Amino acid sequence: LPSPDELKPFPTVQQTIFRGHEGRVRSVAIDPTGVALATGGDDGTVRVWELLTGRQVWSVKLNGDEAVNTVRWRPTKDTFILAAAAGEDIFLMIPTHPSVTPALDQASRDILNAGFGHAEPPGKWARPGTRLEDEGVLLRITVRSTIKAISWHRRGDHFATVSPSGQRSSVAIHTLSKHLTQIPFRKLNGLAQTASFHPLRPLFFVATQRSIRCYDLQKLELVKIVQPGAKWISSFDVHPGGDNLVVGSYDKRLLWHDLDLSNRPYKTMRFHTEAIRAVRFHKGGLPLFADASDDGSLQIFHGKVPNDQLENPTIVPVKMLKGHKVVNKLGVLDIDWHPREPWCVSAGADGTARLWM
Amino acid sequence: APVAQVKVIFTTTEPELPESKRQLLVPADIRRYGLSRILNSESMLDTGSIPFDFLINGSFLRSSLEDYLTSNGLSLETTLTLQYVRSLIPPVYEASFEHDDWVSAVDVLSATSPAGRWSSAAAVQPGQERVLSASYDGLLRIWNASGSVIATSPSGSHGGHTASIKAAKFLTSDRLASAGMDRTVRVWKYTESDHFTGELKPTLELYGHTGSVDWLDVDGHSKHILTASADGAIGFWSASKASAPEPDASLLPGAHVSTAQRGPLGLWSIHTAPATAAIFDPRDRTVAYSASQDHTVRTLDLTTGQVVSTLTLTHPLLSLSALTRTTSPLLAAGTSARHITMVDPRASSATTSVMTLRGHANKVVSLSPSPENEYSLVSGSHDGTCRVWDLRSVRPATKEEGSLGGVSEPVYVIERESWASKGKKKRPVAGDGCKVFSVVWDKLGIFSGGEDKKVQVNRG
Ligand SMILES: [Mg+2]
């Protein structure tokens, strides 16, 4: 009901461009401290950047033949560990960065080494080789099929990977402190697209093409099935309070789910002429979320979760961000918010990452 | 015939006028042109051709006097108090210093520059001033008048910086200070055999910060250094090995936890976000001001190492600068929200009477005050431009801030000559190839370095 003018602050302008990648930038991720950006793309390189200036401070080529599909930081500030998926491997590395003191390096290495010696398998843990080791890449985890999604648990000892063509092994939970990889959900039936942990509870969301399955992690049992009513789900994100979802789809529908009231969508939002590639909630208290589409644009929304005063979520579109160039019918592929500020970064098929504020 | 006239009262800040001749009858249709030759008359000040501008209640006079009267609620027999000022001699492009990488920092060693004055009170210079340039390649460079490199800092392999340099300033003609992504602050000694040959040798390696050291202020009299770092801490340092404590050995490049290695006199983690600025108070060296992305300006008592005051603005702060008015302390704070905020450190929060400098289209990451006009200063932004401000120019705020405080607009815009050279009338988006990282205003000129790998010189 309110107008965008009353709903400040939200990003309106392009302010920093990250250049260096060749081919599509498939993923973007800002470090836990909001100081650095991480990117991965077609050229199979992972690149870490000085966020506001847009300076590349570190990079590594993990695999010559495989593009980096996704990059996700470990959400802990006591370490500086970055995860990257290329092909069927997961790489855990410590980017060379001014924040990495001798102390922080050691703390990070200890976290990566702890699992060692804990008494076609789901996961293969090993050193990645001297070349990658020299650049700070310390672990390679090999799963059965190509990885399209990485999702950390907030405490940073668990992370999930999703391989849409892995069939029975499409969804894996990895435990860092044990170097353990499990396939805990065996009749999931449908093509797993992505997954996420829960911000406050021991729950786990798995998105298939048409629905999102919610699991009890303690019992490994299905609790409920969220029904977005989309023909192909591309992405979803959980609100920090754990009771709300935004869902993106190739059908071009953006969906808000009020989990407390029903398993069907509360609102359906169509602001794109092409498929939606990614959705992301701001995780630091600002009532904002955004979607990314192949039409080259990002739509920023005002989204307030229900409370005392609010019987329903207040959803108001505030700004559409344009600037990414569409290449081969691909536009914006990934989004991430700053931990505290109303700033978002976008992954572009045009070979760039762009900072908006 | 008696043309319609306006009564005016001339007043000024700049030495002035005899009170006998300050009130005057003047043609209502007159303009800035006519009013300044009246000021340049035999009668008034007998200055032949000094160009003047005129401020009326905080606004410059771009049209005739009557137009101002009708624009407002004045009645053409209202007495206008026009305060006249020197017209800004436009700082046009003059030269560029080419680098192979991004220029992160800029500073000038001149007779009037702070380091030059400290030097006189070790050597001093006549017509041979030096320009210091830090680069993301990790090397400092010293330039002279004709834009040629006199000296260059040694690489990391030889005791130099082992990462990109973020900030660097002249302490004196004798000593430099620099900081960067290697979490160190390095004190240098500059020697010049002859005026086209120089040398930089590391005096101290200073350890302390847990992240990139991005901001640097120095005092050449006491040999002290202020630093703001991404770790959210403000560092207070001595540039002499004698008064500098021993380092935290865990922060040393040796640990797996030649040049003397030392620590800070004070390192205070007073911010919940990257510390973007830290400067000495112009009036009192015992006092320091810090600015950070946590939206706060904090005042530091250096002798006790305590936060005696905290000011909380609306937006993240990326740059800070101190002004003389010593009638009061006055700071300029560059914001990530593309504007500047003028503040008095002890306010606790911004009153309705707060001044804002608008015009920039990107992050303002650098600031420098005018050497000759106390009321003026220059800003450096990621939009690729440098904007000159006159704090005497001020109007009420519009619906932009919903009529909160007052707003000043630039009196000049220094464009990036690298971009302007192409003749294109379409600007880089997001400061694509032209971001400005550092600007310094000296009487020798306005020097600005940035992403375009150039130190750009502007002067009248
Ligand atoms: Mg609940």
From Swiss-Prot, chain A:
Effect seen on changing R55A: Weakens, but does not disrupt the interaction with YTM1
Placement of WD repeats on the sequence: 20-59, 63-103, 142-184, 187-225, 228-267, 271-311, 327-357
Annotated compartments: Nucleus, Nucleolus; Nucleus, Nucleoplasm
Known function: Component of the NOP7 complex, which is required for maturation of the 25S and 5.8S ribosomal RNAs and formation of the 60S ribosome.
Subunit description: Component of the NOP7 complex, composed of ERB1, NOP7 and YTM1. The complex is held together by ERB1, which interacts with NOP7 via its N-terminal domain and with YTM1 via a high-affinity interaction between the seven-bladed beta-propeller domains of the 2 proteins. The NOP7 complex associates with the 66S pre-ribosome.
Family affiliation: Belongs to the WD repeat BOP1/ERB1 family.
Descriptive protein name: Ribosome biogenesis protein ERB1
Species annotation: Chaetomium thermophilum (strain DSM 1495 / CBS 144.50 / IMI 039719) (Thermochaetoides thermophila)
Swiss-Prot record, chain B:
Region described as Ubiquitin-like (UBL) domain: 6-86
WD repeats: 118-153, 160-198, 208-247, 249-270, 271-312, 359-399, 431-460
Key word Cell inner membrane present: no
Sorted UniProt keywords: Nucleus, Repeat, Ribosome biogenesis, rRNA processing, WD repeat
GO molecular function, one term: ribonucleoprotein complex binding
GO cellular component entries: nucleoplasm; PeBoW complex; preribosome, large subunit precursor
SMART domains reported for this sequence: WD40 (SM00320)
GO biological process: maturation of 5.8S rRNA from tricistronic rRNA transcript (SSU-rRNA, 5.8S rRNA, LSU-rRNA); maturation of LSU-rRNA from tricistronic rRNA transcript (SSU-rRNA, 5.8S rRNA, LSU-rRNA)
Self-association and partners: Component of the NOP7 complex, composed of ERB1, NOP7 and YTM1. The complex is held together by ERB1, which interacts with NOP7 via its N-terminal domain and with YTM1 via a high-affinity interaction between the seven-bladed beta-propeller domains of the 2 proteins. The NOP7 complex associates with the 66S pre-ribosome. Interacts (via UBL domain) with MDN1 (via VWFA/MIDAS domain).
Identification of the protein by name: Ribosome biogenesis protein YTM1
Organism of derivation: Chaetomium thermophilum (strain DSM 1495 / CBS 144.50 / IMI 039719)
